[PDB]
Amino acid sequence: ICGDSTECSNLLLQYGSFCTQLNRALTGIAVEQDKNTQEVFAQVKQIYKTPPIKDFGGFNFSQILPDPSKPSKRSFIEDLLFNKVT
């Protein structure tokens, strides 16, 4: 609103607490986003790992499991999704 002005700050101070609740609402929104992400994804208590040898009767999950080569440890489909949207 004021951009580093003493006169503007003094003039705005007499308007009362208008923007304090705005800052509170923005902080609440950010906390809400964090809670949304955490509650959507953190559905498990531990971290599991697939066995190194995989023989699932014929089904092939290589396209969905993460690839050890990539440092991001993101699978092919995840890589495509990340690259598509920017």
Partner 1 sequence: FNGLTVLPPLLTDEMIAQYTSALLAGTITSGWTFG
Partner 2 sequence: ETKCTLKSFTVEKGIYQTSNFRVQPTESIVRFPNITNLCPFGEVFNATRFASVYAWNRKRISNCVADYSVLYNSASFSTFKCYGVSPTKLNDLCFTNVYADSFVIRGDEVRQIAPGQTGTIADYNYKLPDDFTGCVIAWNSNNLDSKVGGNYNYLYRLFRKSNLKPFERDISTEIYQAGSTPCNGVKGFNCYFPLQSYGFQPTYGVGYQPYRVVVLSFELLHAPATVCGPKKSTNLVKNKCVNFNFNGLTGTGVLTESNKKFLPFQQFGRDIADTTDAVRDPQTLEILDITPCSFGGVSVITPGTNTSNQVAVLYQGVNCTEVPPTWRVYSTGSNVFQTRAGCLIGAEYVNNSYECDIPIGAGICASYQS
Partner 3 sequence: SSTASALGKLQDVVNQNAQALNTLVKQLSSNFGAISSVLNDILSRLDPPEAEVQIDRLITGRLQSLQTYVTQQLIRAAEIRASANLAAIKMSECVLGQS
Ligand X SMILES: *[C@@H]1O[C@H](CO)[C@@H](O[C@@H]2O[C@H](CO)[C@@H](O)[C@H](O)[C@H]2NC(C)=O)[C@H](O)[C@H]1NC(C)=O
Site residues, partner 2 (CB under 8 A) = 4, 27, 34
The secondary structure of the chain, three-state, reads CCCCCHHHHHHHHCCCCCHHHHHHHHHHHHHHHHHHHHHHHCCCCCCCCCCCCCCECCECCCCCCCCCCCCCCCCHHHHHHHHHCC
Rule CB under 8 A: say whether 65 interacts with partner 1.
Answer: no
Which range in 6-14, 40-48, 63-71, 73-81 contacts partner 1 by CB under 8 A? 40-48
Sites of contact with partner 3 (CB under 8 A): 1-3, 5, 7-8, 11-12, 14-22, 25-26, 29, 32-33, 36-37, 39-40, 43, 80-81, 84-85
Sites of contact with partner 1 (CB under 8 A): 30, 33-34, 37-38, 41-44, 46-49
